[PDB]
PDB file of all heavy atoms in Angstrom:
ATOM      1  N   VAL A 873     162.521 134.613 162.131  1.00 42.95           N
ATOM      2  CA  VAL A 873     162.813 134.171 163.476  1.00 42.95           C
ATOM      3  C   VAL A 873     163.999 134.999 164.016  1.00 42.95           C
ATOM      4  O   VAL A 873     164.750 135.653 163.213  1.00 42.95           O
ATOM      5  CB  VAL A 873     163.143 132.668 163.520  1.00 42.95           C
ATOM      6  CG1 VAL A 873     163.220 132.206 164.973  1.00 42.95           C
ATOM      7  CG2 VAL A 873     162.116 131.865 162.713  1.00 42.95           C
ATOM      8  N   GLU A 874     164.166 134.974 165.334  1.00 45.13           N
ATOM      9  CA  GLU A 874     165.295 135.759 165.949  1.00 45.13           C
ATOM     10  C   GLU A 874     165.472 135.207 167.315  1.00 45.13           C
ATOM     11  O   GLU A 874     164.659 135.216 168.182  1.00 45.13           O
ATOM     12  CB  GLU A 874     164.831 137.190 166.018  1.00 45.13           C
ATOM     13  CG  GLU A 874     165.625 138.083 167.034  1.00 45.13           C
ATOM     14  CD  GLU A 874     165.022 139.440 167.110  1.00 45.13           C
ATOM     15  OE1 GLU A 874     164.858 140.159 166.071  1.00 45.13           O
ATOM     16  OE2 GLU A 874     164.682 139.860 168.273  1.00 45.13           O
ATOM     17  N   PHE A 875     166.721 134.739 167.549  1.00 42.11           N
ATOM     18  CA  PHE A 875     167.198 134.180 168.867  1.00 42.11           C
ATOM     19  C   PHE A 875     168.201 135.142 169.402  1.00 42.11           C
ATOM     20  O   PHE A 875     169.044 135.697 168.683  1.00 42.11           O
ATOM     21  CB  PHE A 875     167.791 132.743 168.722  1.00 42.11           C
ATOM     22  CG  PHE A 875     166.760 131.688 168.473  1.00 42.11           C
ATOM     23  CD1 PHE A 875     166.083 131.564 167.342  1.00 42.11           C
ATOM     24  CD2 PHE A 875     166.498 130.798 169.511  1.00 42.11           C
ATOM     25  CE1 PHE A 875     165.143 130.593 167.146  1.00 42.11           C
ATOM     26  CE2 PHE A 875     165.541 129.798 169.311  1.00 42.11           C
ATOM     27  CZ  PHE A 875     164.877 129.685 168.120  1.00 42.11           C
ATOM     28  N   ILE A 876     168.178 135.376 170.719  1.00 43.16           N
ATOM     29  CA  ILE A 876     169.057 136.305 171.418  1.00 43.16           C
ATOM     30  C   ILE A 876     169.449 135.676 172.776  1.00 43.16           C
ATOM     31  O   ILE A 876     168.534 135.014 173.406  1.00 43.16           O
ATOM     32  CB  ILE A 876     168.358 137.670 171.575  1.00 43.16           C
ATOM     33  CG1 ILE A 876     168.041 138.219 170.236  1.00 43.16           C
ATOM     34  CG2 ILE A 876     169.397 138.631 172.273  1.00 43.16           C
ATOM     35  CD1 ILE A 876     167.116 139.461 170.313  1.00 43.16           C
ATOM     36  N   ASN A 877     170.633 135.932 173.210  1.00 37.48           N
ATOM     37  CA  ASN A 877     171.117 135.603 174.520  1.00 37.48           C
ATOM     38  C   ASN A 877     170.632 134.236 174.944  1.00 37.48           C
ATOM     39  O   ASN A 877     169.921 134.061 175.911  1.00 37.48           O
ATOM     40  CB  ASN A 877     170.632 136.675 175.495  1.00 37.48           C
ATOM     41  CG  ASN A 877     171.301 138.000 175.268  1.00 37.48           C
ATOM     42  OD1 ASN A 877     172.453 138.109 174.970  1.00 37.48           O
ATOM     43  ND2 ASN A 877     170.530 139.103 175.386  1.00 37.48           N
ATOM     44  N   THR A 878     171.032 133.249 174.198  1.00 40.33           N
ATOM     45  CA  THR A 878     170.667 131.884 174.437  1.00 40.33           C
ATOM     46  C   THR A 878     171.809 130.959 174.395  1.00 40.33           C
ATOM     47  O   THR A 878     172.858 131.259 173.797  1.00 40.33           O
ATOM     48  CB  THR A 878     169.549 131.433 173.362  1.00 40.33           C
ATOM     49  OG1 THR A 878     168.495 132.290 173.484  1.00 40.33           O
ATOM     50  CG2 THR A 878     169.144 129.963 173.613  1.00 40.33           C
ATOM     51  N   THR A 879     171.646 129.824 175.102  1.00 41.73           N
ATOM     52  CA  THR A 879     172.791 128.831 175.085  1.00 41.73           C
ATOM     53  C   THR A 879     172.125 127.457 174.846  1.00 41.73           C
ATOM     54  O   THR A 879     171.023 127.192 175.130  1.00 41.73           O
ATOM     55  CB  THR A 879     173.493 128.734 176.461  1.00 41.73           C
ATOM     56  OG1 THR A 879     174.101 129.996 176.681  1.00 41.73           O
ATOM     57  CG2 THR A 879     174.505 127.646 176.428  1.00 41.73           C
ATOM     58  N   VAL A 880     172.899 126.620 174.163  1.00 42.84           N
ATOM     59  CA  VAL A 880     172.473 125.268 173.775  1.00 42.84           C
ATOM     60  C   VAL A 880     173.578 124.297 174.219  1.00 42.84           C
ATOM     61  O   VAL A 880     174.665 124.458 173.890  1.00 42.84           O
ATOM     62  CB  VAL A 880     172.167 125.147 172.276  1.00 42.84           C
ATOM     63  CG1 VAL A 880     171.493 123.867 172.011  1.00 42.84           C
ATOM     64  CG2 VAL A 880     171.365 126.285 171.832  1.00 42.84           C
ATOM     65  N   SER A 881     173.074 123.191 174.904  1.00 43.38           N
ATOM     66  CA  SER A 881     174.016 122.208 175.358  1.00 43.38           C
ATOM     67  C   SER A 881     174.324 121.144 174.317  1.00 43.38           C
ATOM     68  O   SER A 881     175.205 120.305 174.533  1.00 43.38           O
ATOM     69  CB  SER A 881     173.496 121.486 176.603  1.00 43.38           C
ATOM     70  OG  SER A 881     172.381 120.694 176.247  1.00 43.38           O
ATOM     71  N   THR A 882     173.637 121.165 173.156  1.00 41.71           N
ATOM     72  CA  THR A 882     173.826 120.204 172.132  1.00 41.71           C
ATOM     73  C   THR A 882     173.819 120.851 170.816  1.00 41.71           C
ATOM     74  O   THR A 882     173.810 122.116 170.695  1.00 41.71           O
ATOM     75  CB  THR A 882     172.824 119.064 172.249  1.00 41.71           C
ATOM     76  OG1 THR A 882     171.549 119.488 171.850  1.00 41.71           O
ATOM     77  CG2 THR A 882     172.713 118.529 173.670  1.00 41.71           C
ATOM     78  N   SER A 883     173.640 120.100 169.749  1.00 39.81           N
ATOM     79  CA  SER A 883     173.756 120.616 168.397  1.00 39.81           C
ATOM     80  C   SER A 883     172.411 121.164 167.838  1.00 39.81           C
ATOM     81  O   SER A 883     171.390 120.393 167.890  1.00 39.81           O
ATOM     82  CB  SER A 883     174.292 119.544 167.419  1.00 39.81           C
ATOM     83  OG  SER A 883     175.543 119.018 167.857  1.00 39.81           O
ATOM     84  N   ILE A 884     172.430 122.415 167.381  1.00 40.03           N
ATOM     85  CA  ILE A 884     171.264 122.874 166.606  1.00 40.03           C
ATOM     86  C   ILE A 884     171.240 122.038 165.350  1.00 40.03           C
ATOM     87  O   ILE A 884     172.205 121.627 164.739  1.00 40.03           O
ATOM     88  CB  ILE A 884     171.433 124.366 166.378  1.00 40.03           C
ATOM     89  CG1 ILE A 884     171.439 125.130 167.652  1.00 40.03           C
ATOM     90  CG2 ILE A 884     170.301 124.835 165.389  1.00 40.03           C
ATOM     91  CD1 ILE A 884     171.629 126.649 167.378  1.00 40.03           C
ATOM     92  N   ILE A 885     169.974 121.810 164.910  1.00 40.60           N
ATOM     93  CA  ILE A 885     169.792 120.987 163.677  1.00 40.60           C
ATOM     94  C   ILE A 885     168.690 121.606 162.860  1.00 40.60           C
ATOM     95  O   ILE A 885     167.665 122.109 163.385  1.00 40.60           O
ATOM     96  CB  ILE A 885     169.427 119.480 164.072  1.00 40.60           C
ATOM     97  CG1 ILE A 885     170.411 119.018 165.115  1.00 40.60           C
ATOM     98  CG2 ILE A 885     169.431 118.647 162.867  1.00 40.60           C
ATOM     99  CD1 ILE A 885     170.330 117.467 165.407  1.00 40.60           C
ATOM    100  N   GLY A 886     168.880 121.520 161.498  1.00 42.54           N
ATOM    101  CA  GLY A 886     167.850 121.981 160.568  1.00 42.54           C
ATOM    102  C   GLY A 886     167.674 120.968 159.459  1.00 42.54           C
ATOM    103  O   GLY A 886     168.615 120.575 158.853  1.00 42.54           O
ATOM    104  N   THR A 887     166.385 120.657 159.171  1.00 41.23           N
ATOM    105  CA  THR A 887     166.129 119.663 158.078  1.00 41.23           C
ATOM    106  C   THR A 887     164.882 120.099 157.380  1.00 41.23           C
ATOM    107  O   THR A 887     164.160 121.068 157.766  1.00 41.23           O
ATOM    108  CB  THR A 887     165.909 118.258 158.697  1.00 41.23           C
ATOM    109  OG1 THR A 887     164.674 118.221 159.424  1.00 41.23           O
ATOM    110  CG2 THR A 887     167.066 117.874 159.584  1.00 41.23           C
ATOM    111  N   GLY A 888     164.577 119.401 156.310  1.00 44.21           N
ATOM    112  CA  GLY A 888     163.322 119.586 155.592  1.00 44.21           C
ATOM    113  C   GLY A 888     163.384 120.896 154.841  1.00 44.21           C
ATOM    114  O   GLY A 888     164.426 121.556 154.646  1.00 44.21           O
ATOM    115  N   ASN A 889     162.177 121.352 154.402  1.00 46.35           N
ATOM    116  CA  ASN A 889     162.049 122.501 153.580  1.00 46.35           C
ATOM    117  C   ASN A 889     162.001 123.793 154.440  1.00 46.35           C
ATOM    118  O   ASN A 889     161.191 123.877 155.448  1.00 46.35           O
ATOM    119  CB  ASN A 889     160.741 122.458 152.783  1.00 46.35           C
ATOM    120  CG  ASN A 889     160.843 123.323 151.452  1.00 46.35           C
ATOM    121  OD1 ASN A 889     161.916 123.474 150.907  1.00 46.35           O
ATOM    122  ND2 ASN A 889     159.697 123.888 151.136  1.00 46.35           N
ATOM    123  N   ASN A 890     162.885 124.720 154.195  1.00 44.30           N
ATOM    124  CA  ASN A 890     162.936 125.946 154.936  1.00 44.30           C
ATOM    125  C   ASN A 890     163.095 127.179 154.001  1.00 44.30           C
ATOM    126  O   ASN A 890     163.841 127.068 153.034  1.00 44.30           O
ATOM    127  CB  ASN A 890     164.160 125.891 155.862  1.00 44.30           C
ATOM    128  CG  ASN A 890     164.247 124.659 156.727  1.00 44.30           C
ATOM    129  OD1 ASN A 890     163.242 124.079 156.978  1.00 44.30           O
ATOM    130  ND2 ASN A 890     165.465 124.275 157.086  1.00 44.30           N
ATOM    131  N   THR A 891     162.362 128.225 154.318  1.00 46.71           N
ATOM    132  CA  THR A 891     162.425 129.449 153.512  1.00 46.71           C
ATOM    133  C   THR A 891     162.454 130.618 154.491  1.00 46.71           C
ATOM    134  O   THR A 891     162.076 130.579 155.602  1.00 46.71           O
ATOM    135  CB  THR A 891     161.189 129.533 152.578  1.00 46.71           C
ATOM    136  OG1 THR A 891     160.014 129.673 153.421  1.00 46.71           O
ATOM    137  CG2 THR A 891     161.039 128.295 151.736  1.00 46.71           C
ATOM    138  N   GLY A 892     162.930 131.750 153.968  1.00 46.60           N
ATOM    139  CA  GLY A 892     163.032 132.967 154.776  1.00 46.60           C
ATOM    140  C   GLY A 892     164.422 133.114 155.423  1.00 46.60           C
ATOM    141  O   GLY A 892     165.410 132.476 154.959  1.00 46.60           O
ATOM    142  N   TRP A 893     164.516 133.999 156.343  1.00 47.74           N
ATOM    143  CA  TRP A 893     165.776 134.311 157.013  1.00 47.74           C
ATOM    144  C   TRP A 893     165.682 134.123 158.531  1.00 47.74           C
ATOM    145  O   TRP A 893     164.685 134.486 159.199  1.00 47.74           O
ATOM    146  CB  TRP A 893     166.132 135.779 156.752  1.00 47.74           C
ATOM    147  CG  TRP A 893     165.075 136.743 157.089  1.00 47.74           C
ATOM    148  CD1 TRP A 893     164.039 137.217 156.321  1.00 47.74           C
ATOM    149  CD2 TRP A 893     164.887 137.353 158.385  1.00 47.74           C
ATOM    150  NE1 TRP A 893     163.272 138.115 157.027  1.00 47.74           N
ATOM    151  CE2 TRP A 893     163.765 138.215 158.325  1.00 47.74           C
ATOM    152  CE3 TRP A 893     165.576 137.315 159.605  1.00 47.74           C
ATOM    153  CZ2 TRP A 893     163.338 139.012 159.346  1.00 47.74           C
ATOM    154  CZ3 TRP A 893     165.140 138.040 160.674  1.00 47.74           C
ATOM    155  CH2 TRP A 893     164.029 138.899 160.571  1.00 47.74           C
ATOM    156  N   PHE A 894     166.724 133.494 159.076  1.00 46.27           N
ATOM    157  CA  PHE A 894     166.878 133.237 160.500  1.00 46.27           C
ATOM    158  C   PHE A 894     168.076 133.931 161.100  1.00 46.27           C
ATOM    159  O   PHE A 894     169.108 134.126 160.417  1.00 46.27           O
ATOM    160  CB  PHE A 894     167.019 131.737 160.740  1.00 46.27           C
ATOM    161  CG  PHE A 894     165.944 130.873 160.157  1.00 46.27           C
ATOM    162  CD1 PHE A 894     166.091 130.250 158.981  1.00 46.27           C
ATOM    163  CD2 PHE A 894     164.725 130.779 160.811  1.00 46.27           C
ATOM    164  CE1 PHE A 894     165.102 129.488 158.453  1.00 46.27           C
ATOM    165  CE2 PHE A 894     163.688 130.020 160.285  1.00 46.27           C
ATOM    166  CZ  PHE A 894     163.892 129.354 159.113  1.00 46.27           C
ATOM    167  N   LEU A 895     167.939 134.393 162.301  1.00 46.88           N
ATOM    168  CA  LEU A 895     168.998 135.159 162.962  1.00 46.88           C
ATOM    169  C   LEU A 895     169.223 134.494 164.354  1.00 46.88           C
ATOM    170  O   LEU A 895     168.292 134.212 165.090  1.00 46.88           O
ATOM    171  CB  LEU A 895     168.655 136.567 163.127  1.00 46.88           C
ATOM    172  CG  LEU A 895     169.464 137.424 164.127  1.00 46.88           C
ATOM    173  CD1 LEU A 895     170.921 137.402 163.779  1.00 46.88           C
ATOM    174  CD2 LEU A 895     168.978 138.897 164.152  1.00 46.88           C
ATOM    175  N   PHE A 896     170.510 134.356 164.710  1.00 50.25           N
ATOM    176  CA  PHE A 896     170.943 134.025 166.028  1.00 50.25           C
ATOM    177  C   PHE A 896     171.990 135.016 166.504  1.00 50.25           C
ATOM    178  O   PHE A 896     172.946 135.276 165.820  1.00 50.25           O
ATOM    179  CB  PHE A 896     171.508 132.584 166.084  1.00 50.25           C
ATOM    180  CG  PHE A 896     170.752 131.628 165.200  1.00 50.25           C
ATOM    181  CD1 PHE A 896     171.351 131.075 164.019  1.00 50.25           C
ATOM    182  CD2 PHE A 896     169.456 131.215 165.556  1.00 50.25           C
ATOM    183  CE1 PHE A 896     170.727 130.195 163.249  1.00 50.25           C
ATOM    184  CE2 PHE A 896     168.760 130.306 164.731  1.00 50.25           C
ATOM    185  CZ  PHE A 896     169.382 129.803 163.637  1.00 50.25           C
ATOM    186  N   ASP A 897     171.800 135.474 167.684  1.00 50.05           N
ATOM    187  CA  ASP A 897     172.666 136.533 168.257  1.00 50.05           C
ATOM    188  C   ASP A 897     173.121 136.126 169.638  1.00 50.05           C
ATOM    189  O   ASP A 897     172.286 135.811 170.502  1.00 50.05           O
ATOM    190  CB  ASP A 897     171.983 137.901 168.299  1.00 50.05           C
ATOM    191  CG  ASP A 897     172.839 138.993 168.879  1.00 50.05           C
ATOM    192  OD1 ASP A 897     174.089 138.844 168.850  1.00 50.05           O
ATOM    193  OD2 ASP A 897     172.307 140.002 169.338  1.00 50.05           O
ATOM    194  N   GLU A 898     174.431 136.104 169.851  1.00 48.56           N
ATOM    195  CA  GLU A 898     175.062 135.706 171.154  1.00 48.56           C
ATOM    196  C   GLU A 898     174.515 134.330 171.533  1.00 48.56           C
ATOM    197  O   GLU A 898     174.352 134.049 172.719  1.00 48.56           O
ATOM    198  CB  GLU A 898     174.660 136.676 172.283  1.00 48.56           C
ATOM    199  CG  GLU A 898     174.715 138.173 171.816  1.00 48.56           C
ATOM    200  CD  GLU A 898     176.067 138.499 171.310  1.00 48.56           C
ATOM    201  OE1 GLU A 898     177.069 137.813 171.552  1.00 48.56           O
ATOM    202  OE2 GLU A 898     176.210 139.561 170.622  1.00 48.56           O
ATOM    203  N   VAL A 899     174.318 133.488 170.526  1.00 50.25           N
ATOM    204  CA  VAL A 899     173.748 132.107 170.791  1.00 50.25           C
ATOM    205  C   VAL A 899     174.943 131.124 170.819  1.00 50.25           C
ATOM    206  O   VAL A 899     175.411 130.629 169.801  1.00 50.25           O
ATOM    207  CB  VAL A 899     172.762 131.807 169.699  1.00 50.25           C
ATOM    208  CG1 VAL A 899     172.393 130.233 169.793  1.00 50.25           C
ATOM    209  CG2 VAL A 899     171.546 132.579 169.857  1.00 50.25           C
ATOM    210  N   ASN A 900     175.530 130.955 171.996  1.00 49.59           N
ATOM    211  CA  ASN A 900     176.557 129.941 172.181  1.00 49.59           C
ATOM    212  C   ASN A 900     176.028 128.602 171.819  1.00 49.59           C
ATOM    213  O   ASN A 900     174.840 128.296 172.097  1.00 49.59           O
ATOM    214  CB  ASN A 900     177.015 129.970 173.618  1.00 49.59           C
ATOM    215  CG  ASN A 900     177.271 131.325 174.184  1.00 49.59           C
ATOM    216  OD1 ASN A 900     177.844 132.237 173.543  1.00 49.59           O
ATOM    217  ND2 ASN A 900     176.840 131.563 175.420  1.00 49.59           N
ATOM    218  N   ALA A 901     176.826 127.807 171.093  1.00 48.94           N
ATOM    219  CA  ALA A 901     176.363 126.495 170.640  1.00 48.94           C
ATOM    220  C   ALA A 901     177.548 125.514 170.599  1.00 48.94           C
ATOM    221  O   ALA A 901     178.738 125.940 170.360  1.00 48.94           O
ATOM    222  CB  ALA A 901     175.797 126.598 169.299  1.00 48.94           C
ATOM    223  N   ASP A 902     177.262 124.257 170.937  1.00 50.25           N
ATOM    224  CA  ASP A 902     178.342 123.205 170.887  1.00 50.25           C
ATOM    225  C   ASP A 902     178.548 122.812 169.388  1.00 50.25           C
ATOM    226  O   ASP A 902     179.679 122.400 169.100  1.00 50.25           O
ATOM    227  CB  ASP A 902     177.832 122.017 171.653  1.00 50.25           C
ATOM    228  CG  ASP A 902     178.945 121.061 171.989  1.00 50.25           C
ATOM    229  OD1 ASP A 902     180.036 121.260 171.434  1.00 50.25           O
ATOM    230  OD2 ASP A 902     178.758 120.153 172.735  1.00 50.25           O
ATOM    231  N   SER A 903     177.612 122.922 168.528  1.00 50.05           N
ATOM    232  CA  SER A 903     177.818 122.638 167.108  1.00 50.05           C
ATOM    233  C   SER A 903     176.519 122.997 166.340  1.00 50.05           C
ATOM    234  O   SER A 903     175.495 123.218 166.961  1.00 50.05           O
ATOM    235  CB  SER A 903     178.203 121.127 166.877  1.00 50.05           C
ATOM    236  OG  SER A 903     177.082 120.307 167.290  1.00 50.05           O
ATOM    237  N   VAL A 904     176.679 123.048 165.020  1.00 50.43           N
ATOM    238  CA  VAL A 904     175.569 123.399 164.174  1.00 50.43           C
ATOM    239  C   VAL A 904     175.587 122.475 162.934  1.00 50.43           C
ATOM    240  O   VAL A 904     176.725 122.111 162.456  1.00 50.43           O
ATOM    241  CB  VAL A 904     175.645 124.848 163.679  1.00 50.43           C
ATOM    242  CG1 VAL A 904     174.541 125.158 162.629  1.00 50.43           C
ATOM    243  CG2 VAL A 904     175.551 125.753 164.872  1.00 50.43           C
ATOM    244  N   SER A 905     174.469 122.053 162.491  1.00 51.39           N
ATOM    245  CA  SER A 905     174.315 121.136 161.295  1.00 51.39           C
ATOM    246  C   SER A 905     173.098 121.633 160.438  1.00 51.39           C
ATOM    247  O   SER A 905     172.013 121.882 161.082  1.00 51.39           O
ATOM    248  CB  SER A 905     174.164 119.716 161.763  1.00 51.39           C
ATOM    249  OG  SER A 905     173.777 118.925 160.620  1.00 51.39           O
ATOM    250  N   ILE A 906     173.313 121.531 159.148  1.00 47.36           N
ATOM    251  CA  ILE A 906     172.253 121.946 158.255  1.00 47.36           C
ATOM    252  C   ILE A 906     172.166 120.859 157.184  1.00 47.36           C
ATOM    253  O   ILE A 906     173.196 120.446 156.619  1.00 47.36           O
ATOM    254  CB  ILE A 906     172.441 123.310 157.671  1.00 47.36           C
ATOM    255  CG1 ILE A 906     172.582 124.407 158.667  1.00 47.36           C
ATOM    256  CG2 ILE A 906     171.335 123.681 156.662  1.00 47.36           C
ATOM    257  CD1 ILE A 906     171.286 124.679 159.422  1.00 47.36           C
ATOM    258  N   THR A 907     170.968 120.392 156.831  1.00 48.05           N
ATOM    259  CA  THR A 907     170.784 119.383 155.783  1.00 48.05           C
ATOM    260  C   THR A 907     169.457 119.655 155.015  1.00 48.05           C
ATOM    261  O   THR A 907     168.898 120.766 155.209  1.00 48.05           O
ATOM    262  CB  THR A 907     170.843 117.978 156.340  1.00 48.05           C
ATOM    263  OG1 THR A 907     169.531 117.734 157.030  1.00 48.05           O
ATOM    264  CG2 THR A 907     171.910 117.773 157.354  1.00 48.05           C
ATOM    265  N   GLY A 908     169.075 118.767 154.231  1.00 49.37           N
ATOM    266  CA  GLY A 908     167.752 118.802 153.588  1.00 49.37           C
ATOM    267  C   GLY A 908     167.812 119.594 152.298  1.00 49.37           C
ATOM    268  O   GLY A 908     168.859 120.076 151.802  1.00 49.37           O
ATOM    269  N   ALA A 909     166.642 119.783 151.698  1.00 46.21           N
ATOM    270  CA  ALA A 909     166.399 120.480 150.472  1.00 46.21           C
ATOM    271  C   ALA A 909     165.946 121.914 150.717  1.00 46.21           C
ATOM    272  O   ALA A 909     165.658 122.633 149.734  1.00 46.21           O
ATOM    273  CB  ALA A 909     165.446 119.747 149.592  1.00 46.21           C
ATOM    274  N   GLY A 910     165.924 122.343 151.934  1.00 44.07           N
ATOM    275  CA  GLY A 910     165.559 123.721 152.229  1.00 44.07           C
ATOM    276  C   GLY A 910     166.434 124.771 151.592  1.00 44.07           C
ATOM    277  O   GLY A 910     167.598 124.441 151.160  1.00 44.07           O
ATOM    278  N   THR A 911     165.961 125.961 151.387  1.00 45.42           N
ATOM    279  CA  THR A 911     166.623 127.037 150.669  1.00 45.42           C
ATOM    280  C   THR A 911     166.510 128.307 151.521  1.00 45.42           C
ATOM    281  O   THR A 911     166.337 129.390 150.889  1.00 45.42           O
ATOM    282  CB  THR A 911     166.158 127.247 149.268  1.00 45.42           C
ATOM    283  OG1 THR A 911     164.792 127.598 149.302  1.00 45.42           O
ATOM    284  CG2 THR A 911     166.275 125.910 148.483  1.00 45.42           C
ATOM    285  N   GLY A 912     166.664 128.248 152.783  1.00 46.88           N
ATOM    286  CA  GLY A 912     166.623 129.390 153.657  1.00 46.88           C
ATOM    287  C   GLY A 912     167.980 130.068 153.827  1.00 46.88           C
ATOM    288  O   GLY A 912     169.014 129.596 153.288  1.00 46.88           O
ATOM    289  N   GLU A 913     167.975 131.119 154.666  1.00 48.98           N
ATOM    290  CA  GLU A 913     169.232 131.886 154.931  1.00 48.98           C
ATOM    291  C   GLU A 913     169.403 131.956 156.423  1.00 48.98           C
ATOM    292  O   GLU A 913     168.677 132.613 157.111  1.00 48.98           O
ATOM    293  CB  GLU A 913     169.138 133.259 154.362  1.00 48.98           C
ATOM    294  CG  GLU A 913     169.054 133.337 152.846  1.00 48.98           C
ATOM    295  CD  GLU A 913     168.848 134.690 152.300  1.00 48.98           C
ATOM    296  OE1 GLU A 913     168.422 135.601 153.095  1.00 48.98           O
ATOM    297  OE2 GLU A 913     169.054 134.971 151.091  1.00 48.98           O
ATOM    298  N   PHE A 914     170.419 131.169 156.924  1.00 49.20           N
ATOM    299  CA  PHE A 914     170.797 131.163 158.312  1.00 49.20           C
ATOM    300  C   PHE A 914     171.890 132.245 158.589  1.00 49.20           C
ATOM    301  O   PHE A 914     172.909 132.200 157.881  1.00 49.20           O
ATOM    302  CB  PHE A 914     171.204 129.842 158.778  1.00 49.20           C
ATOM    303  CG  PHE A 914     170.225 128.755 158.522  1.00 49.20           C
ATOM    304  CD1 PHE A 914     170.248 127.988 157.371  1.00 49.20           C
ATOM    305  CD2 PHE A 914     169.243 128.436 159.436  1.00 49.20           C
ATOM    306  CE1 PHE A 914     169.352 126.991 157.119  1.00 49.20           C
ATOM    307  CE2 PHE A 914     168.260 127.479 159.193  1.00 49.20           C
ATOM    308  CZ  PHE A 914     168.366 126.732 158.063  1.00 49.20           C
ATOM    309  N   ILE A 915     171.674 133.070 159.502  1.00 47.50           N
ATOM    310  CA  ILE A 915     172.580 134.174 159.856  1.00 47.50           C
ATOM    311  C   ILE A 915     172.976 133.947 161.318  1.00 47.50           C
ATOM    312  O   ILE A 915     172.196 134.018 162.202  1.00 47.50           O
ATOM    313  CB  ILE A 915     171.964 135.528 159.611  1.00 47.50           C
ATOM    314  CG1 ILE A 915     171.743 135.807 158.145  1.00 47.50           C
ATOM    315  CG2 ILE A 915     172.929 136.666 160.224  1.00 47.50           C
ATOM    316  CD1 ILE A 915     170.727 136.837 157.830  1.00 47.50           C
ATOM    317  N   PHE A 916     174.338 133.889 161.501  1.00 51.07           N
ATOM    318  CA  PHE A 916     174.931 133.804 162.807  1.00 51.07           C
ATOM    319  C   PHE A 916     175.638 135.038 163.254  1.00 51.07           C
ATOM    320  O   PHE A 916     175.941 135.913 162.380  1.00 51.07           O
ATOM    321  CB  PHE A 916     175.851 132.585 162.969  1.00 51.07           C
ATOM    322  CG  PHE A 916     175.160 131.251 162.954  1.00 51.07           C
ATOM    323  CD1 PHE A 916     174.819 130.701 161.714  1.00 51.07           C
ATOM    324  CD2 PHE A 916     174.758 130.604 164.078  1.00 51.07           C
ATOM    325  CE1 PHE A 916     174.168 129.479 161.671  1.00 51.07           C
ATOM    326  CE2 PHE A 916     174.141 129.408 164.035  1.00 51.07           C
ATOM    327  CZ  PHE A 916     173.846 128.857 162.786  1.00 51.07           C
ATOM    328  N   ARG A 917     175.886 135.270 164.489  1.00 49.98           N
ATOM    329  CA  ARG A 917     176.550 136.412 164.968  1.00 49.98           C
ATOM    330  C   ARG A 917     176.911 136.277 166.481  1.00 49.98           C
ATOM    331  O   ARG A 917     176.203 135.642 167.265  1.00 49.98           O
ATOM    332  CB  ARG A 917     175.621 137.623 164.840  1.00 49.98           C
ATOM    333  CG  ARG A 917     176.269 138.920 164.985  1.00 49.98           C
ATOM    334  CD  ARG A 917     175.431 140.089 164.352  1.00 49.98           C
ATOM    335  NE  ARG A 917     175.309 139.886 162.947  1.00 49.98           N
ATOM    336  CZ  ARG A 917     174.452 140.551 162.199  1.00 49.98           C
ATOM    337  NH1 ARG A 917     173.592 141.486 162.727  1.00 49.98           N
ATOM    338  NH2 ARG A 917     174.390 140.350 160.848  1.00 49.98           N
TER     339      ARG A 917
END
């Protein structure tokens, strides 16, 4: 996945099983939360 030039008015959330690599670029965010048994790789920038 790949997010670019995006804004979020609330909290990004991740749950459940996750695999692979995620990228967010210039993604302004009010907050971020990660939970669950997933084993992915979240990359911010």
